[PDB]
Amino acid sequence: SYLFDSKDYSTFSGVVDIIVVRQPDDSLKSMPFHIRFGTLKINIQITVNDKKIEDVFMLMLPEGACYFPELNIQKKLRPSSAILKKFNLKNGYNKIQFIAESGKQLIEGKIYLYNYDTKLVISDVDGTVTKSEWTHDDIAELYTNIQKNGYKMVYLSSRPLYFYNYTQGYLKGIIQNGFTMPDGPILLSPDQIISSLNREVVYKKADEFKGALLKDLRRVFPEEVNPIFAGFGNRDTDATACLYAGVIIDNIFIINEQSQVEILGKQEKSSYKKINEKIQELFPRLP
Ligand SMILES: [Ca+2]
């Protein structure tokens, strides 16, 4: 908190976790790339899973945001399937690295590959994982068991970019009665990642930022699948975004100040503990 205030050498260097999805025709589609090279005034090379990607590169804009030069030359945050196929991604987590050649600066990141039939479970972070940092009791066990049954937890954050790396540590350092938070991408509300390449629509919203994020996530999947199975949040604005994103009302969970989880569709007040007891009824194992 007081580090940025005075150190001042903490502009964001890093990458926001990337999501890629294999379509049924074997093509690849990804969410927008958001990578920043801190205090750099250029080409960028990529290395995935400790393997350099030959003849693929990004450029940087004066403001610091990077993009893919792709001809129809348009500056693209979403690379083409041909670029993404050169990554040779594996299912689940992949290590990705970007090297800006000015000297040479390196940022490491995460890039996830899902199949079009993957079922995701969304979880807000502030107020949903954290308790207004204290964590709600028993969430790690629940989320762990949800992940065991075949779903992929996706975390949602609206914190400024300079807290992104911090946020990754907090989630990954949580321990409850031996359980930990399943690894998954932390998506960022588009209002926290503004740049010339994405001003167009983000600039013109208010509380639809979460909904815009959920639909940017929906659109890397084919329109004929409902990839978002369930949602965890703590404000009614979370439920509204889940509802407009196609999540059935029975799979929307909203926690309040005293850790009471309302299952909207059932008009049932519950808890992470009780929801975990019914994990197989509420989150049935996937084949
Ligand atoms: Ca919240």
Written as one string, the DSSP assignment of 209-220 is HHHHHHHHHHTT
Q: Nearest-CA neighbor of 18 among 83, 100, 64, 105?
A: 83
DSSP conformational letter for 207: S
Say how many Å lie between the first and final Cα of the chain, rounded: 45
- Tell which phi-psi region holds residue 168, choosing left (phi > 0), alpha (psi between -120 and 50) or beta: alpha
DSSP conformational letter for 201: H
Q: 102-108: long-range contacts at Cβ-Cβ below 8 A with a sequence spacing of 24 or more?
A: 102/40, 102/42, 105/13, 105/37, 105/38, 105/40, 107/13, 107/14, 107/15, 107/35, 107/36, 107/37, 108/14, 108/15
- The binding site for Mg(2+) consists of 124, 126, 234
- The binding site consists of 124, 126, 234, 238
| CATH class of the region 117-282 | alpha beta
CB 270 within 8 A of CB 262: yes
Tokens representing residue 165 in the block: 């790396």
Distance of CA 263 to the CA centre of its chain: 23
**203 Cα: distance to centroid of ligand 1 (angstroms):** 21
Q: What is the CATH number of domain 9-114?
A: 2.60.40
Elucidated via: X-ray
Give the total residue count for the chain.
287
Give the environment of ion ligand 1: residues with CB less than 5 A. 124, 126-127, 234
Q: Nearest-CA neighbor of 286 among 227, 217, 231?
A: 227
Q: At what angle do helices 236-244 and 209-218 cross, to 10 degrees?
A: 30
- The binding site for Ca(2+) consists of 124, 234, 238
Span(s) in the chain for CATH 3.40.50.1000: 117-282
Instruction: Round to whole Å and give the CA distance between 187 and 122.
Output: 10
**108 Cα: distance to centroid of ligand 1 (angstroms):** 27
**182 Cα: distance to centroid of ligand 1 (angstroms):** 19
Instruction: Round to whole Å and give the CA distance between 215 and 98.
Output: 27
Helix (H, G, I), strand (E, B) or coil at 234: coil
